[PDB]
Amino acid sequence: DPIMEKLNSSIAYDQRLSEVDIQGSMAYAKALEKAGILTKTELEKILSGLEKISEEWSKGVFVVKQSDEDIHTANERRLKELIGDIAGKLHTGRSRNDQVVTDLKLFMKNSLSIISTHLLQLIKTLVERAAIEIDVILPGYDHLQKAQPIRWSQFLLSHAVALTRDSERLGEVKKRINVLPLGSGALAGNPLDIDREMLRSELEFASISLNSMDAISERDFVVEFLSFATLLMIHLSKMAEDLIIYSTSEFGFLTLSDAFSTGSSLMPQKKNPDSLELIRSKAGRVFGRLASILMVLKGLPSTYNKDLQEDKEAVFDVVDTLTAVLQVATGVISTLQISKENMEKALTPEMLATDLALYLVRKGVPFRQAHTASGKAVHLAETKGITINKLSLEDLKSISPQFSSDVSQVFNFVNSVEQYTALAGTAKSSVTTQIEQLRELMKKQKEQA
Amino acid sequence: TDPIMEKLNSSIAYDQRLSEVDIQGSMAYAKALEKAGILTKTELEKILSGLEKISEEWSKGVFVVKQSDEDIHTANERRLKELIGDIAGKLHTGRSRNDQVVTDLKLFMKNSLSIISTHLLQLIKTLVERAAIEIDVILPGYDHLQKAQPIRWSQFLLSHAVALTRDSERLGEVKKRINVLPLGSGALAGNPLDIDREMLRSELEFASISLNSMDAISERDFVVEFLSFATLLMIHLSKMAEDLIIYSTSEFGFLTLSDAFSTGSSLMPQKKNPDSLELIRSKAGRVFGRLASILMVLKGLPSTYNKDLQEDKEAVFDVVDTLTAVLQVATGVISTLQISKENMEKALTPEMLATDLALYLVRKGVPFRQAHTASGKAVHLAETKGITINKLSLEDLKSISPQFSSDVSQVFNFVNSVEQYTALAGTAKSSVTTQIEQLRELMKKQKEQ
Amino acid sequence: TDPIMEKLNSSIAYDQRLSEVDIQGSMAYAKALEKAGILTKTELEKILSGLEKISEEWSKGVFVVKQSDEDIHTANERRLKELIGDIAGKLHTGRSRNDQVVTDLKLFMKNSLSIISTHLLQLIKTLVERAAIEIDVILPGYDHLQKAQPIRWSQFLLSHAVALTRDSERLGEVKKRINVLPLGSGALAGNPLDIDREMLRSELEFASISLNSMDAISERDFVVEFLSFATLLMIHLSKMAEDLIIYSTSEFGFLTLSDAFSTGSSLMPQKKNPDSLELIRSKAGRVFGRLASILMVLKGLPSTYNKDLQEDKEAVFDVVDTLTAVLQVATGVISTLQISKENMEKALTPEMLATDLALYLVRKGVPFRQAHTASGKAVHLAETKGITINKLSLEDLKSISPQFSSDVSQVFNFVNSVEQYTALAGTAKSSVTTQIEQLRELMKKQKEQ
Amino acid sequence: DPIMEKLNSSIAYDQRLSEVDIQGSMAYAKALEKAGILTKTELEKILSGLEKISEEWSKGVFVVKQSDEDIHTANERRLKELIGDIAGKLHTGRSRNDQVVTDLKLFMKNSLSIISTHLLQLIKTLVERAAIEIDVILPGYDHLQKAQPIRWSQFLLSHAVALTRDSERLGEVKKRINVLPLGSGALAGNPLDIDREMLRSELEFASISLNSMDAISERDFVVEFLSFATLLMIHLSKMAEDLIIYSTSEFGFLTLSDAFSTGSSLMPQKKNPDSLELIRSKAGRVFGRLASILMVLKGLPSTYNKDLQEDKEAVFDVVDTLTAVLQVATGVISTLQISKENMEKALTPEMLATDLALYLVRKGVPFRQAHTASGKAVHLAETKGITINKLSLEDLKSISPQFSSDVSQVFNFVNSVEQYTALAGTAKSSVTTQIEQLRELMKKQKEQ
Ligand SMILES: N/C(=N\CCC[C@H](N)C(=O)O)N[C@H](CC(=O)O)C(=O)O
Ligand SMILES: N/C(=N\CCC[C@H](N)C(=O)O)N[C@H](CC(=O)O)C(=O)O
Ligand SMILES: N/C(=N\CCC[C@H](N)C(=O)O)N[C@H](CC(=O)O)C(=O)O
Ligand SMILES: N/C(=N\CCC[C@H](N)C(=O)O)N[C@H](CC(=O)O)C(=O)O
């Protein structure tokens, strides 16, 4: 049945595993010779023939045949075409089962190294920008309503901190991915007493799988990777939402560069944040991949089943998505233009009523009564038609004798943010400390490779 | 006000579960307020004594929730005021429901993850102990749910333990990021009174403190992470449930669940319905549903706190209770089930040794393809003669290949079959013994960490 | 035998909500048994009288559940035997918990869907009626959250009304399939006593009866469909919520939610937090989680009944109560919010009419591309001259295109702008009026059901 | 930025809408002529160029250029290359916003027509085999444990019934997709009083969209279709699970044809049900698409947002999956071979104890005593080390005087299944009724 054949066939996409597939075969071939299954000459011939395939794929000259069901079959066909019947001894004791997961894990390890580089660069970009714009203040929001003054850098660092947790998760996922599954056979293990330690060393895996059935049937490494990817996209979807809103003419806090926005010649001042919308939408694209693999795996019996073939397309899509999205995010953050003018202009006296209460608290007035007094000043100012920073000292003392002339220091946005010196707060000293901690964090994550 | 709105916005019905951790969070905060001079020594002693009283009321189940209590935080503060008067009002000085709630939830999850760890490790131990005892049992290994080759029952049991061990490793990783103190982050900009966060960390027993107030109050990574860990864990259990359910059918006849974990009718006494395993399998969907819920709640939310975040609690409570129950039922099922060694061995057929026959020749220098062709001839010859392959005469085999010697009779032995897989992770007895040792060493580390 | 197993397997804690429909199902079944000659007429009056007392105990909230009650079915039968004696035992003859439970759930959902319909239709009517009253209001239409062109505020309200109308239509389709009787399917192969299913249908008021016993007992399509309907409805509400939240910011300043549906502090009386809309938006995630869980529970399950199916009830109850609460809060928000006609009008700018300037030329025969270029030239000229395009003189415009006449001044009028959209579905007043009448008709048709 | 350009670009996949995009433009062109935006002669040249572009794609010779952002741009570019400046008047009053949703609905409408055909064929295949193999009896399962004898046909029809509901849902989704969005403009509607009724008739939609903002921003039609597709895959995953189980050597009820299974020459009698496994896995793949679009749409503000671009890849994947999946399922069901002998041999006397109790119930014995009596009978058989059908009448009469020699009829598997004559039951008359009802249903649905 032609519909069955096409549906079962994976060559159209698993071709991307061409190079890692060859590497796993070179490693296995060398182990077969050490095991005496192949002669030294036979090994030379096989390795030389495998190097030719690698090049054919590398130059984009490899010819796929209608007969090729998967990349494994395709490569064995080509080898035989280049070196003859000796190519048939290469698959001795091996199965497509441990071969395919070996391929995928090598591919993922390479891909995770690339993702890490782009992820760390995004974090670095946010942190550097926070260091440069440390004096900029704007409103901090809750329920998307202006609450209090905060440093723009505190906002940037909040995203950087979350992204560092994603980087930490990436490292954890990479560790479990860096475990050799080759030599598990079809399900009960390799029957030729193959040297798995040699395979590990050759393919550069950190250790080898503990159980053959598990090694062959689990896709924990795929789910794990997809969970890491999804949470990372959630973080990006939130940063995107923040920046799209701040870029509105209504907010007017920042403007995206021409490279990351779209516009019209009829309305030259209108810039659409297409880049951020693309990023936000990928949270769903990536989550969908996580959702599908979890459902594919649910309730499946041991050991290998054809259902597992759905892993490949999900992993490739997410790898490419993450790679593209992280670079665009980096570009957006490094090239956007902020309006310090509009950010400061958005700060209002009404946002300092909480600070007025804290002024009383610092003088020994209980929390409740200080709250009540500040509320009274706010109301009194409203009835007089003025702002609280304009209330006369006499006005204030009519509400509380505790209000002294130094209360004028409350009505200053820099003074407001500087109250937050406790670790992690928005005071400049605290932001400075956060930047030092992140720089150290980036170093040890890059270090851990 | 609107009654429907009030009910929808209110969280007291479910967040009461945080009663004790909320009290613990307030005691620590009280101590720090005294060190900061917001509370006097005497005020501190009275506040602590009062919170201690409230902790006991909840413990004995005599705490009285009032219609006016919108949440657990409000109920505790109301009750503390009823108990000690006006000074109770100084407790919330500089604190927010925003940093209070994530502190409460992380303390709750840390204690819950310790309980879950205990049950997960017991399940793993139970599987490993049974694999060590039933180490000689041999049965069919399956792929595409079709009989493939003989394997040790213990290799099957260890395949599940290995996967659950990765689940335990992930649990530790999630616990680490949960063990970070968010208190002292305020509503979003940090604590305004230079509260000593290191003191709060030590009192509450967290490993470190949060780096950025905005991230600390708005992120729910710790919830997502926990849910991803729990979902993959349920996936594993759904696979093990699928295996046992099938193995427990009369058709397979490999094992029978105990009465405690199955249901039956007096009209068909020998019919045992595996209700326990079906409950377990279905919980994968229940847990995955909570993971999907929270990811959608967080996707695209702006900074910082939004009421959308309140959905985290019911998801966490449900999953914690589900895992605690499910893990214990699984341990019970595994330790109390009865296998049929006879039925398992009877399921092993000569036809399953055709691959071993080809390996027999392979180990004699016969090229893979040719040995594969030869085994096929023997299989065919046996067919036309209405006999099993272990019944073909030596002369008959020799007509096929001259490399078939009399020692070929050892191929037709299921113990000899599984003993081929001595390569690390295979189903040979020595490999199984090794795995048991490795898993025990891994559990030792995970438990002492 | 195992306490954890027992608590996990037991459903009485929640399925108890099916108490009344379970009793109605038993009354209909009792009558059918009497027709089959299984019950005497005298026995039937006793049974029916007994069931009525049980109905009242639940209604008055006096029904006492016992530790032995595994589920509502067992609870009700227990009580019946306590009320009338041994004759109570004849009620379950030929019946199974399998066909009994799905009957109960569909009766419950049919009743719940009727209630949800009323709320949904009320939300829709609220939007339509408000659109009619505020038909003269004009504000910016947005794409990529950037001001694009003037639109009627009513066009915005009606866009949400139209989507919700499709939700109402889907609710109707879902209700039709739920309105099919499964009672009389037995455990899996059918009712063994030639029960009169048509009589059962009539008594319980279903529209038709299930076609196949195995399907009727195992399928949970009706649960899935309801959940899909609920999830799309929540998606619509999450979008309306997002819109309203943004419009209510002080930056946009387009509308203010009433006190009943917002929260705030006495320190910032002008700051109104849209809790109501945030609660609604988050419920999209809560509802989607339930759909996700049931789909995962059902995937790959074999026929016929399995304990996995018990996960359906909690998901249905949650979504039913969530939708009932959210629709009413949504109705309250829409009907009580106050718009700022002044701010909506002030947001309309001349820059938003450059496209209309191009359309002015297109209607006089200027080819699209050239008119666009001409309008672009006017935009640049205004910029250089230091004014806005509505200020360019006729001499200015004629220098761009001789097709500009004195009547071009009519282009610079926001009412004239929205009035260009008379084609069906557009924002012109006549189109908005038409939509309102089309929606009033759809609501009438749907309300009639 | 190259990365940004590549990410924003949709040409790689949206070119699949090449034909419907053209049909949309032709219909639009005709409407422009009627409104006086185009002369009859300008219309003739535009339609001639769109026709040629239609052929280039058909013949697979259309050349996509690095500058093409999407299919809409690619066609307009080529149109200008072919007929010059007049090409530019085509987009007058139109937006890529209402243009793209028009193309997707046209495509989905055509796709749903093809899906319906394969779905109805699958249903027919199940129903007709049920009629032919109506006498076959095998065990019925609950908790995957043998419960009671049932007809194989009742099993086949249980799947046919669920699939008929998927068909009904397909028809419902199709109706809402069959609504014209063209003429909605970028968001406020069409500005030149374009004749939408004319566009509707030309494109053959059943009606036109009610609100421009909704028409351009909603993707309900994508969600609905993915919901229909996901529930259909759930049904197929369940059927796959049953068949995979029944094909094990342990059950031995059936064998798949060589075309839909895989094997090895070393173990000739062993067939792997690869087809069914592929089918089962597609439930996750389709569900993944549903999950992704729901997340994409959640919390988006009005009106158009680039986030909406994610709809196309999900729709294409799911359309192609259902098409292939349904046809493979039809093949599997039509070509599999059952073992009447194995199905029959699996029926056990112990599967009739329930029937024994029912026997007393019809004799007027209360359900509880009937059950207890049958229970005492099973235990007495056990002790005696014999099957319940081996008990003597005397032994039965000692448990309950209601047992008469006619109790012999209870121990017969056909009589067992024949008890279920109530509509929808497994008795032959009820199975016959189901076959008839389903044939009429398919008729009504086909006459869609
Ligand atoms: N076909 C096969 N493995 C397929 C793995 C590769 C597949 N494209 C995938 O992605 O899972 N192997 C076993 C037998 C074996 O190769 O040992 C079988 O199912 O027959
Ligand atoms: N109400 C409030 N936070 C609610 C947190 C607890 C809530 N039940 C949840 O679960 O998120 N806090 C701020 C103000 C504050 O308490 O600092 C607000 O929204 O106004
Ligand atoms: N237990 C049972 N049905 C459970 C249905 C109710 C359950 N709480 C649910 O919600 O699924 N019935 C069958 C047999 C029968 O009652 O006919 C069984 O599993 O033994
Ligand atoms: N670019 C655009 N629509 C893109 C729709 C097609 C897109 N490939 C998709 O799939 O959503 N149109 C508007 C303006 C317009 O075409 O009227 C814009 O955002 O600039």
Side-chain angles (χ1 to χ4, degrees), chain A residues 1-5 7-11 13 68 306-307 309-310, chain B residues 144, chain D residues 244 256-263 271-282 320-321 323-333 335:
Chain A
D1 188 70
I3 303 299
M4 174 59 183
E5 296 294 293
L7 192 60
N8 202 12
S9 165
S10 53
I11 185 54
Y13 54 86
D68 301 333
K306 238 298 160 29
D307 308 60
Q309 175 161 280
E310 294 286 317
Chain B
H144 307 289
Chain D
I244 287 177
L256 298 187
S257 69
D258 293 343
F260 300 105
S261 63
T262 59
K271 290 192 171 182
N272 301 311
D274 287 48
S275 56
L276 295 175
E277 293 177 358
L278 289 162
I279 296 293
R280 184 175 56 192
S281 72
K282 302 302 183 171
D320 292 342
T321 293
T323 293
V325 147
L326 289 172
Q327 297 181 88
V328 176
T330 292
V332 174
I333 297 300
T335 65

Side-chain angles (χ1 to χ4, degrees), chain C residues 143-144, chain D residues 10 70 72 95-97 100 186 304 308-309 312:
Chain C
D143 68 331
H144 309 290
Chain D
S10 55
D70 50 43
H72 318 111
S95 169
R96 294 287 181 238
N97 293 0
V100 68
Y304 175 82
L308 303 177
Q309 178 158 282
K312 286 166 275 295

Side-chain angles (χ1 to χ4, degrees), chain D residues 207-261:
Chain D
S207 59
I208 70 180
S209 54
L210 305 177
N211 186 93
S212 63
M213 299 177 71
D214 169 71
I216 286 337
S217 72
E218 70 96 359
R219 290 301 184 282
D220 281 23
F221 69 100
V222 177
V223 177
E224 289 207 274
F225 167 67
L226 299 178
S227 291
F228 141 74
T230 300
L231 225 197
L232 165 59
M233 290 305 313
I234 290 297
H235 288 154
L236 297 174
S237 72
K238 174 184 173 182
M239 185 175 87
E241 177 85 347
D242 285 327
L243 268 18
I244 287 177
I245 295 306
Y246 292 167
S247 80
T248 59
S249 54
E250 288 80 359
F251 277 65
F253 297 157
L254 59 87
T255 302
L256 298 187
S257 69
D258 293 343
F260 300 105
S261 63

Side-chain angles (χ1 to χ4, degrees), chain A residues 10 72 95-97 100 186 304 306 308-309 312, chain B residues 144, chain D residues 272:
Chain A
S10 53
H72 317 302
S95 155
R96 296 304 179 204
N97 293 355
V100 68
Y304 178 85
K306 238 298 160 29
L308 306 175
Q309 175 161 280
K312 256 73 71 191
Chain B
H144 307 289
Chain D
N272 301 311

Side-chain angles (χ1 to χ4, degrees), chain B residues 142 144 147 242 251 278, chain D residues 141 143 241 250 270 277:
Chain B
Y142 296 80
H144 307 289
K147 299 211 272 190
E242 177 81 349
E251 287 76 4
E278 290 167 9
Chain D
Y141 301 74
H143 303 295
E241 177 85 347
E250 288 80 359
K270 187 253 268 286
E277 293 177 358

